[PDB]
Structures are given as C-alpha cells and as structure tokens.
Amino acid sequence: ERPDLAWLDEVTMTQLERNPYEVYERLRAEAPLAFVPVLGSYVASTAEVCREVATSPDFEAVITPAGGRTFGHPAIIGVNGDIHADLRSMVEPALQPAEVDRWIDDLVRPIARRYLERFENDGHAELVAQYCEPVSVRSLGDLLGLQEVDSDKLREWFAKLNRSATNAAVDENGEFANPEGFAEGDQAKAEIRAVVDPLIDKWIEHPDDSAISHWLHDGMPPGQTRDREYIYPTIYVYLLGAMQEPGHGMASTLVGLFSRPEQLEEVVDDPTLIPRAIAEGLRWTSPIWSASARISTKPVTIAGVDLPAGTPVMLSYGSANHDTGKYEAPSQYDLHRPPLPHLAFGAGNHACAGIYFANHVMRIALEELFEAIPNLERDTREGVEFWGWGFRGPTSLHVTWEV
Numbered sequence: 001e002r003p004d005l006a007w008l009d010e011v012t013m014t015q016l017e018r019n020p021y022e023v024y025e026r027l028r029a030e031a032p033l034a035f036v037p038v039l040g041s042y043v044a045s046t047a048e049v050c051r052e053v054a055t056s057p058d059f060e061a062v063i064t065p066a067g068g069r070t071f072g073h074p075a076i077i078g079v080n081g082d083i084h085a086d087l088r089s090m091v092e093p094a095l096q097p098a099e100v101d102r103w104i105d106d107l108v109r110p111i112a113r114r115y116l117e118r119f120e121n122d123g124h125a126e127l128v129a130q131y132c133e134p135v136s137v138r139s140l141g142d143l144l145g146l147q148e149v150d151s152d153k154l155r156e157w158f159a160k161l162n163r164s165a166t167n168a169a170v171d172e173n174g175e176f177a178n179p180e181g182f183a184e185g186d187q188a189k190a191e192i193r194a195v196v197d198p199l200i201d202k203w204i205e206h207p208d209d210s211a212i213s214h215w216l217h218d219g220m221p222p223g224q225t226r227d228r229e230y231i232y233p234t235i236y237v238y239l240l241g242a243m244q245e246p247g248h249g250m251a252s253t254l255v256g257l258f259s260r261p262e263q264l265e266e267v268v269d270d271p272t273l274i275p276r277a278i279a280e281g282l283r284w285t286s287p288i289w290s291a292s293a294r295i296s297t298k299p300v301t302i303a304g305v306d307l308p309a310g311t312p313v314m315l316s317y318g319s320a321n322h323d324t325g326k327y328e329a330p331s332q333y334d335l336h337r338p339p340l341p342h343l344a345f346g347a348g349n350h351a352c353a354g355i356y357f358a359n360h361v362m363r364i365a366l367e368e369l370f371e372a373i374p375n376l377e378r379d380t381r382e383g384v385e386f387w388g389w390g391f392r393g394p395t396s397l398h399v400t401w402e403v
C-alpha cells in the first residue's frame, strides 16, 4: 500500500517472532505508524505514537484479531464503557497497593524458597523452567484460588494461550494464514473449563478469599453472582499474560544483568537496587512486546497517516521502549540509565492493572535468588534465545555456580 514501505511485504511472522528489533528500528525511522501486511494491521512503533494512541480520546480498546479468536468476549483488554468499568472494578481490589502490601511477602517469599530449595545446591539450573515461571504462576495461582493446579499445568496453559493469541499471520487475502494454531488455544481453554467450572460451582455457594470468588461476588446484589461466561475471558487473560509476564520480566532482567557483570555484582551486593534493575529489564525486553491494540472511533491523523474511523492499531510497546528519541543505546541493558518513563505496562485507561503486584513478585523472586546463590553466573557454553513478537522473553536461562 505505502510505496516506499514495499519491503514490509517481505517481512515474515517467523522473522518478527525471532527478533523484531531490526524491522521495528526501520519502522521507527521510516513510518512510526505503518501497515504491516503479515500482521494485517497498522502498527505503532515509537514512544510518541504508542503513548498518543493509548491515551487518545479518539481511540478505544480493541483486541488484536488473534487475541479475539483466542479470548472471545468480554476480554477486559478488548472492551470499553460500562463492561470495561465493571471488569476493572472486578479485578482491582486484590491489586490495590495498600492491599498487596498486606500479604505479598508471605505469598511470594515462601514460594520462591520452595522452588530454590529444589536446585540451590545443584550448581546448575535452567532458571526459566526451574524458577522464574513457577514462582510467577504459583504466586498468581494461589492468589486466584488455583492452589490445586500444578505449576507445570499453569505453565503449559499460558504457553498454549501464548501461541494462539499471537497466531497473527495473515495471507494476502487478509485471512489467518495458520488457523490450526488456534486449536491448542481451544484445547487449553477446554482443560481450563474442566478444572475451573467445579471451582466456580463451589465459590458460588461457598465464597472464600480467593480472587476468582471475589470476581463472582463483589458488588453483586444479595445471592447473585456474575455469570461465569461473563468472567471467563478475563480468566483467560490472566492465565496468559498475568501468569507469564512476571516470569518473563525477571528472567529478562537477569539476562540483562549478566550482560553487564559489574552491574550484576552491584545488585547482588545491594539488593535495594533490584527494583531499579527490574524497571530497566522491562524496558530492555518488554514482556508484553506487541499484544495490545486500540481502534479509532473518529477519523484521525497520526504521524502523517490519515486513519479512517474504525482502524485498529497494534501498540508495539516493546519497540517503543527502544525509541532512540528517548534513550541512548537502548539495545544495551544499563541499570544506571536515568529512571525515565517507559511503556512496558502500557498507558491510559487500559494500562496494566497489576503493576504493583507484578513488580513485587519480580522483586521478591530476585531477592531470594540472589541471597540463595550470590555467586550466580551465566553458563557461557549455552546461548540465550529470546522468542516472541506479541509476548517476548528468553526461552531458557542456563546458569552455574561454584558449589
């Protein structure tokens, strides 16, 4: 469509999944708002355009097409107006900072210890599978009321939901190129229903302190609950991004710290710097890289593009967090970067609802990890592969330490 961007026609999904940064660097210089054929959508790549689209009164939330096929309605990420306000009201109580501070430490710290105890004396570990992901899912799972769902199962569900919700590739007719990729999303949803429908059955008659029970009961007239079909899409949104991203964020922070060994040493010596290390990790490899979207409600002009009403725009926050108009050498992890704003949690009315919770989950897990294994070192004989365009993180993180 845009003639000087004809090279975009040769960009593939695989290339974006394996490393999107080269394409998006060109996009930030050539076309901060650009239609990307394989994605079938306009894409916002700079911090200015992302921030503008995310906060504009001329835009409302929309779900990406593969996200919609995966989550259905009403996914909190893709609804507006009254439904959105109800769902925000539904999820916000356990995420309130004053509430998180009451219990986050007794929640996450014993969990981190239980997983650290399985390997802290081995001298080698794969931290993604053995620590980062389990701590992340076990923490949220217990908060939700999924105490009896195994870590390994929560991790399998978010991986399947991941691949389904990012199955974004379209052919030249605008149709999904790989419709089979939605099947494992459908299978994960089916397993989730078989496991969670009995829990909802119980919570409806016997409410408890689990978050999902509060989603059913909070703000409802006496004897009434929100219909399960009304809350399931948001349960799926949790069982993907809320389960996956704090694991991705702490693992990416570790990889960044390993890439700067004197900063890693500084953080191990002074664990009060862990929150600053995590914030730079989120900027350096944003866990939610390009999975949120908005849609114009009016005709709008963004970055010299005139958009008709009803135009979706994907927000590639992960690219915006490497904006060289904001940062010096963004592809380099640097703990001592000035604490500038970043977009790893989004912006506007649909900005992440779990920021305060997530930052504490990541802080505590890194605290316990560095105290258990202060001589942690990356295994230089293994490579670290980052994967993902919609959600991005390291596929594994092999480490060693002298025992």
Ligand code: HEC
Residues within 6 Å of the ligand: 054, 076, 077, 078, 088, 091, 095, 140, 241, 242, 243, 245, 246, 249, 282, 286, 287, 288, 292, 293, 317, 343, 344, 345, 346, 347, 348, 349, 350, 351, 352, 353, 354, 355, 357, 358, 359
């Ligand atoms: C306990 C729940 C929870 C956790 C954990 C969580 N999130 Fe959020 N996040 C949400 C919810 C709910 C939304 C949807 C907000 C909405 O659409 O109103 C969201 C939305 C987002 C968005 C989209 C915002 C936008 O502008 O469209 C981003 C980006 C995001 N989260 C990043 C993260 C990152 C990064 C982490 C972890 C490091 C994380 N999330 C962990 C609950 C969570």
Ligand SMILES: COc1cc(C=O)ccc1O
Residues within 6 Å of the ligand: 077, 236, 237, 238, 239, 240, 241, 242, 288, 291, 292, 293
């Ligand atoms: C916080 O969970 C999710 C967030 C997003 C934001 O774009 C997309 C899918 C998810 O499951």
